[PDB]
């Protein structure tokens, strides 16, 4: 059948791709630069697909082949093709190339291919052994470049334990590996390990532990924008649970801004959900466009109903949407925040009143916010003013709420501070861009 | 110039029938039935009956079906005769006639496929333009957004290759109608103002209807100077508005700052706009934008005004003006704030320097986000 | 013809006299201007609002107490407008660089 022949063709182009990747790994090893490693792991997700049993069998029978225990470990875990007519001997290593032991980069990359393919076959137990052997091999290695590769497999390791639904037999190991990376002053490995540990903490709901670590540990700035986005999302969740709502909103906005354009639909959906919830907690109505995006329409539709209910001020609609779709929030891990918003809706009305009016009396505020008594209105407006949501003061002598008069900000030092932040960022960008300049010898 | 098939009046009457308060109307039913029986429109009769749960007249339906069948047989016979004896021009004309009849009798998919086949066989550029215009008319009749967009792109490309000014003007009218259909009122006002002096697409609507649409959309889109120069002082617009006192009053009340008359005329315009088949979903949006426009125009000339002054100017109560003002400030549409103790609205229009600084902050923040993303992408 | 042209002339004369009696003051009330030009307060207020709206003589009416303030319309600060234009220009340049950098 010609279909099998075309499958063989795409398989051998994948073989060429992985040959190029291992060549780049060796060039990084012999070129004293880790950026080639980063490029190899950047091409890694693209070739994580398009592979089958024979692709990996020919890979492991083309590389390694030094009669080491590696062959005895990875060959039995995957099937083998029959005596095919096209017995094209794929041997990237010839003689002395096959004689020397494989570099940690190439062996780690091929073992990574084994574990991701095994995961794609959805038999997690088989991949568990290969991952454990991989990280037994790479634990002793202190290669700086390998850490990059190590970083990636680190993530994959946690990933497989997600399908094993344990996430706890390895928590101590991730802690120790993160500590090792910290003493190695590594950037990528430390960042990815922090992200994985935070994900584990939130999966097991240990928010206090995550808050303690993020207070103690420092996320490396010089990390991947993807890892930065994951860390920002986790930190935003932490601050939202810790009631630090404004900082959580800012952090989640930064995470959304650093999202991979249109690559991670699920991560963007979760970030949008949490950001909408926390923004509602602040009393700010979110952007409407979020609900009309092609990928986030149905996902945020219950949140559209929630936002409509709170903006309209109909607490009955709030309870109704809690009854029908609120259970979904439990699957989304936001139910507690939604209850907090159920009991914090009135903040949005107070903010609206402050935005529109400037000297509205307490009785008018109570009338427009469905508050039973003017004294309750006084309490609510005073609390909102104290909690940094309103910029007014209540003249209790005659009961009117005078907002702080708007002063010409350009005549103040605020524009200077904003321009200072912008100038510092621009100068830092110029320094970073000129600092590398990558002039080869 | 171009034939009135399909009739947009039929679509307007069907939409009016679909409206709740006009569902029980009879005159709309009489006019639509007269149009169908003058056109012998059977498939669209079935579609309307199933959409409106109407009681189909078996005798009339059978007569329409038989007439359509014999006519289609006649067109097929003419097509075969042209193929056997005549050249490609006569077979092309026969196929265009068949597609035109299919669109006339209300067939949507049949007309689409026949016109597509004709366009495949069409060579003369003018006839390709005519077929594309027919497809655009069908899409407007059925409000098919994808069909309208694709045919608009096709017509634009064809005119760019070779375009006579007449067909370009007609395409401008069609584009303005579609822009109205998609609430893109700025482009619709642009096109309608460009085509008001040379409006020749009478198949879409009468001149008075086109001018009313132009006035409405230009009012919602143009600022005060452009509205005064191009609409208030418009020659043809004023000429036709001499025969439309209501639309003229609505337009001139806002320009002359007669806000009570303007509000009454806006209520009348909203009532007219609800029944319109093309301005249907945007009537609330148009009314809200007009209210915001009137409020902003009044507040542009005042620093601090009593709420009673607006209540008297717009001819409303204090409570209503207060509620509308509060809702529009809360949405960030009006640059003012209300002192309910004194019931005085004080404008908060930023000065030139403050507005420039805010725009600089916004644009620089966007550009710096782009710069940071680019740098993090390229520096590995 | 007579009615239209005389109405136009009367409006222009009203505008000219309103500008003439507004040069000395800075925060004159509408009542004093109405007394000076001898019309109703409402007509004068409506005319002044029309001139202010139409980018005529610069000032804002304070209906709360009854005043029409006057100022000197600060120019526009050409520096900031050119800065905004440059920000847009290098936004375009950043899009162009986004078109580049696709070659790794």
């Amino acid at each position: 059948a010609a279909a099998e022949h075309s499958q063989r063709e795409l398989d051998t182009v994948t073989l060429e791709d992985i040959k190029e990747h291992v060549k780049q790994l060796e060039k990084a090893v012999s070129g004293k630069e880790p950026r080639f490693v980063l490029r190899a792991l950047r091409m890694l997700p693209s070739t994580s697909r398009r592979l089958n049993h024979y692709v990996l069998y020919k890979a492991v029978q083309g590389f390694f082949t030094s009669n080491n225990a590696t062959r005895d470990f990875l060959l039995p875990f995957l099937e083998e093709p029959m005596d095919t007519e096209a017995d094209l001997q794929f041997r990237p290593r010839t003689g002395k190339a096959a004689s020397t032991p494989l570099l940690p980069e190439v062996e780690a990359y091929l073992q990574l291919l084994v574990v991701i393919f095994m995961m794609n076959s959805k038999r997690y137990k088989e991949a568990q052994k290969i991952s454990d052997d991989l990280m037994q091999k790479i634990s002793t290695q202190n290669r700086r470049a390998l850490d990059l590769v190590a970083a990636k497999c680190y993530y994959y390791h946690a990933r497989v334990y997600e399908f094993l639904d344990k996430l706890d037999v390895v928590r101590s190991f991730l802690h120790a590996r993160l500590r090792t990376a910290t003493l190695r002053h590594d950037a990528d490995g430390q960042a990815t390990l922090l992200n994985l540990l935070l994900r584990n903490y939130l999966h097991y709901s240990l928010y206090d532990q995550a808050e303690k670590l993020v207070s103690k540990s420092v996320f490396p700035e010089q990390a991947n924008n993807n890892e930065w986005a994951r860390y920002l999302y986790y930190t935003g969740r932490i601050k939202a649970i810790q009631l630090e709502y404004s900082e959580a909103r800012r952090t989640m906005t930064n995470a959304l801004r650093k999202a991979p354009q249109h690559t991670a639909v699920g991560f963007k959906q979760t970030v949008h959900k949490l950001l909408i919830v926390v923004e509602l907690l602040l009393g700010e109505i979110p952007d409407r466009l979020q609900f009309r995006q092609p990928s986030l329409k149905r996902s945020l539709m219950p949140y559209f109903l929630l936002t409509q209910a709170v903006r309209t001020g109909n607490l009955a609609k709030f309870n109704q949407v809690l009854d029908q779709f609120g259970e979904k929030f439990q699957a989304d891990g936001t139910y507690t925040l939604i209850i907090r918003l159920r009991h914090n809706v009135i903040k949005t009305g107070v903010r609206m009143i402050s935005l529109s009016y400037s000297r509205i009396s307490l009785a008018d505020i109570a009338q427009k916010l469905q508050l039973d008594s003017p004294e309750d209105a006084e309490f609510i407006v005073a609390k909102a003013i104290r909690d940094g949501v309103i910029e007014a003061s209540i003249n209790h002598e005659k009961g009117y709420v005078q907002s702080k008069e708007m002063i010409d900000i350009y005549s103040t030092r605020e524009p200077q501070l904003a321009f200072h932040q912008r100038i510092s960022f621009c100068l830092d960008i110029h320094n970073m861009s000129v600092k590398a300049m990558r002039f080869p010898p | 110039g171009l034939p009135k098939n399909p009739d947009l009046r039929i679509a307007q009457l069907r939409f009016l029938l679909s409206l709740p308060e006009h569902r029980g109307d009879a005159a709309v039913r009489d006019e639509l039935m007269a149009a169908v029986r003058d056109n012998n429109m059977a498939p669209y009769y079935e579609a309307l009956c199933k959409s409106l749960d109407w009681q189909i007249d078996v005798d009339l339906l059978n007569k329409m079906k038989k007439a359509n069948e014999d006519e289609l047989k006649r067109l097929d016979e003419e097509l075969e005769d042209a193929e056997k004896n005549l050249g490609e021009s006569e077979i092309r004309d026969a196929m265009m006639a068949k597609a035109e009849y299919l669109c006339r009798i209300g067939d949507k998919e049949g007309a689409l496929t026949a016109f597509r086949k004709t366009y495949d066989k069409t060579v003369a550029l003018g006839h390709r333009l005519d077929i594309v215009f027919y497809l655009l008319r069908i899409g407007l009749f059925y409000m098919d957004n994808d069909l309208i967009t694709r045919n608009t792109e096709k017509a634009k490309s064809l005119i760019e290759e070779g375009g006579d000014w007449d067909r370009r003007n007609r395409l401008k009218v069609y584009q303005g109608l579609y822009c109205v259909a998609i609430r893109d009122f700025k482009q619709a006002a642009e096109l309608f103002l460009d085509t008001v002096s040379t409006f020749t697409s009478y198949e879409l609507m009468d001149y008075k209807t086109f001018v009313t649409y132009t006035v409405y959309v230009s009012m919602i889109a143009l600022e005060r100077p452009d509205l005064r120069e191009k609409v208030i002082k418009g020659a043809e617009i004023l000429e036709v508005l001499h025969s439309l006192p209501a639309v003229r009053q609505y337009l001139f009340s806002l320009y002359e700052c007669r806000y009570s008359v303007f509000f009454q005329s806006l209520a009348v315009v909203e009532q007219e706009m609800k029944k319109d088949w093309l301005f249907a979903p945007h009537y609330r949006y148009y009314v809200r934008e007009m209210r915001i426009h009137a409020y902003s125009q009044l507040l542009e000339s005042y620093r601090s005004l009593t709420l009673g002054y607006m209540a008297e100017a717009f001819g409303v109560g204090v409570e209503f003006i207060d509620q509308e003002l509060s809702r529009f400030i809360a949405a960030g549409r009006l640059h003012c704030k209300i002192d309910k103790v004194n019931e005085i609205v004080e404008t908060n229009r930023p000065d030139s320097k403050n507005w420039q600084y805010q725009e600089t902050i916004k644009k620089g923040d966007l550009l710096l986000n782009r710069v940071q993303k680019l740098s993090r992408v390229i520096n590995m | 013809i007579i009615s239209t042209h005389l109405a136009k002339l009367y409006d222009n004369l009203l505008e000219q006299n309103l500008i003439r009696v507004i040069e000395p003051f800075s925060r004159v009330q509408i009542e004093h201007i109405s007394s000076l030009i001898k019309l109703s307060k409402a007509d004068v207020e409506r005319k002044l609002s029309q001139m202010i709206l139409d980018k005529k003589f610069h000032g804002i009416l304070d209906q709360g107490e009854g005043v029409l303030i006057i100022f000197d319309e600060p120019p526009v600060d050409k520096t900031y407008e050119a800065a905004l234009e440059t920000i847009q220009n290098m936004s375009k340049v950043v899009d162009s660089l986004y078109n580049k950098a696709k070659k790794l």
Binding site: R422, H430, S433 | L368, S375, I378 | T86, A101, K103
Partner: peptide
């Protein structure tokens, strides 16, 4: 701030050009 932004964009363009040039040389070596 405008001048600093101008300089940063120029430096970013220069870095992109340099990376493109060195990759071009590396691929043209083979």
């Amino acid at each position: 701030y405008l001048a600093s932004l101008i300089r940063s964009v120029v430096a970013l363009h220069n870095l992109i050009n340099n990376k493109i040039a060195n990759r071009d040389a590396e691929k043209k070596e083979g």
